[PDB]
């Protein structure tokens, strides 16, 4: 259940983000589930889930540049570069200590 729900959500996120109406541009060959009584239903679900993760992962990392977003969050929140916040405290030292 989790795999099905997350595969569908991830493909929906990809479509809504990159604007594609459907995945025709990729021209990939896909196999559909032939029947509910087929023996490879779990394998097909796993393959679809892996495809969805592959696409969403590459979107986030290559396209949306998530690795740099991690460094930006580190700097802004945990002061991995403390120069700016030091200037801020110095500039407003009298105010910050007031009630």
């Amino acid at each position: 259940q989790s795999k099905i729900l997350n595969t569908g959500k991830y493909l929906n996120i990809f479509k809504r983000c990159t604007g594609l109406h459907n995945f025709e541009s990729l021209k990939e060959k896909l196999t559909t589930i032939t029947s509910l009584a087929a023996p490879d239903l779990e394998l097909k679900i796993d393959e679809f889930y892996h495809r969805a993760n592959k696409m969403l992962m590459k979107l986030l990392f290559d396209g949306y540049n998530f690795p740099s977003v991690v460094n930006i969050f580190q700097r802004l929140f945990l002061f991995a570069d403390s120069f700016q916040i030091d200037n801020f405290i110095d500039s407003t030292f009298s105010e910050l200590k007031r009630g």
């Binding site: 991995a80 570069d81 030091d86």
Partner: peptide, 9 residues
């Protein structure tokens, strides 16, 4: 070369 700490003289 700023880091986490010692940002001032």
């Amino acid at each position: 070369f700023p880091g986490y700490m010692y940002s001032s003289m």
